[PDB]
C-alpha cells in the first residue's frame, strides 16, 4: 500500500465521528505523498482557490493537479489512505464505495467526477472542524465521457447568447432508461476557456495532409444510407453530416509517403485523445470475485489497477 496516514487533528463532534465511519471506501484528494498530513488540505475549502470556488469544470481542473486516495481503515486517531497514483499494487484489491445512482456493470473502467448530480450532492458537514466535504462520484467511463462534453458545451453557450431562450438543456442523460438531470448554476469562464482551447488546439493537429482525401467521400456516406441498416443507424439525425451534403487538389509531391495511412495516425493523436485531456484519468476497474455481474448503489466493490 505504501501506507499514508491522515490524523484526526483537533476534536470531534460525537455523531460526526460516525459520519467518518460511513465514508469508508470513498476518495480523498490530497495534493501530496505524505507519511502524515493535516486534514486542512483535504476538504473543499482547500479546493476553493484564491477568493473563488471552482465550477464543476474548474473542479475537474482542480482534481487535475491533486492526488486521489482510498479510505482503507478508519481509526478515531487517524485515517489510513492508500496513494492511488503509486500504491495500487494490491492483489488484495483495496475496496471502494460506489456512491452513484447508476448500477454499473462488471468490467467497467471507473473514473472520478465531481458531484454535479441533482440529488447526490455527497455533502457532509463538520462544524467542530469547520470544513465542507464533496466526495467525487465514481462512474463508468463512457458515461463519464458523456458528461464532460455536455458541461463544456453548456459553457460554450455561456460565451454566446443570439438564439432564443429555449435552448437544448444538455441536462437529460440516457443509460438504458434512467432520465438524469444535473445542476446548471454557475459557469466560471477560465475553466471553460482553457478547456475550450485544448478542444480547439488538439483538433487543429488532428487534421493532416492526407486527411483531406477522406473529405471527398462525404457524399459516399449517404449512398450507404438508403440501402442498409447499420449505416443509417450510424448516421445521426442531429448531425452536420446530413447537413453538409447540400477534389484531390493534386499538389502531388513524391507520392511515396503513404498519405492516407499517415492521416489516421495524427488524427488519433489528438482527436483520439479527447476524453482524458479534458477529464481525469481512469485507473479504477470493476472486478468482483464472486461472479456478481453488477455492483449496487452503496456497495463495496473490489478495485483493480489501470485499464
Amino acid at each position: 500500500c505504501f501506507e499514508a496516514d491522515i490524523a484526526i487533528p483537533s476534536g470531534i463532534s460525537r455523531p460526526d465521528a460516525a459520519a467518518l465511519q460511513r465514508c469508508e471506501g470513498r476518495v480523498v484528494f490530497l495534493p501530496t505523498i505524505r507519511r502524515q498530513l493535516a486534514l486542512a488540505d483535504v476538504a473543499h475549502e482547500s479546493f476553493v482557490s484564491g477568493g473563488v470556488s471552482p465550477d464543476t469544470l474548474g473542479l475537474l481542473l482542480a482534481y487535475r493537479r491533486r492526488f486521489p486516495a482510498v479510505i482503507t481503515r478508519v481509526l478515531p486517531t487517524r485515517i489510513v489512505a492508500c496513494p492511488v497514483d503509486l500504491g495500487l499494487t494490491h492483489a488484495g484489491t483495496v475496496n471502494l464505495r460506489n456512491t452513484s445512482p447508476v448500477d454499473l456493470c462488471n468490467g467497467d473502467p471507473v473514473s472520478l467526477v465531481p458531484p454535479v448530480f441533482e440529488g447526490q450532492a455527497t455533502d457532509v458537514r463538520l462544524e467542530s472542524l469547520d470544513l465542507t466535504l464533496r466526495f467525487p462520484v465514481p462512474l463508468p467511463t463512457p458515461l463519464a465521457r458523456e458528461i464532460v462534453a455536455r458541461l463544456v458545451a453548456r459553457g460554450i453557450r455561456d460565451l454566446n447568447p443570439r438564439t432564443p431562450g429555449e435552448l437544448p438543456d444538455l441536462n437529460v442523460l440516457y443509460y438504458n432508461g434512467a432520465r438524469l438531470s444535473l445542476v446548471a448554476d454557475v459557469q466560471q469562464l477560465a475553466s471553460v476557456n482553457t478547456e475550450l482551447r485544448s478542444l480547439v488546439l488538439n483538433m487543429v493537429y488532428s487534421i493532416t495532409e492526407g486527411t483531406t482525401l477522406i473529405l471527398t467521400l462525404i457524399p459516399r456516406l449517404l449512398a450507404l444510407s438508403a440501402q442498409d441498416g447499420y449505416v443509417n443507424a450510424l448516421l445521426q439525425m442531429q448531425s452536420v453530416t446530413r447537413e453538409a451534403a447540400q477534389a484531390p487538389m493534386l499538389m502531388q509531391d513524391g507520392e511515396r509517403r503513404l498519405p492516407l495511412y499517415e492521416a489516421l495516425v495524427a488524427w488519433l493523436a489528438h482527436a483520439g485523445q479527447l476524453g482524458d485531456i479534458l477529464a481525469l484519468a481512469p485507473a479504477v476497474r470493476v472486478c468482483t470475485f464472486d461472479g456478481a455481474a453488477v455492483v449496487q448503489s452503496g456497495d463495496m466493490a473490489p478495485v483493480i489497477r489501470y485499464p
Partner: protein, 49 residues
C-alpha cells in the same frame, strides 16, 4: 488453496467430487403443480427494430 491479497491471507477450500446416474431405466421424475405468480405482467410492449 491459499491466496494472499490486501488486508490479510485468504484461504479458499474446495473438494472435488462427481456423480453418476446408476440407473438403467428412468429414475426420479418431478411433477409441477402449484403456481406462486407470473414473473411478467403478460405484455403490451411494442418491439422496436
Amino acid at each position: 488453496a491459499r491466496h494472499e491479497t490486501g488486508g490479510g491471507v485468504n484461504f479458499t477450500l474446495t473438494q472435488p467430487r462427481g456423480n453418476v446416474d446408476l440407473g438403467v431405466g428412468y429414475t426420479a421424475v418431478a411433477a409441477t403443480g402449484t403456481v406462486r405468480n407470473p414473473v411478467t405482467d403478460m405484455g403490451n410492449l411494442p418491439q422496436n427494430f
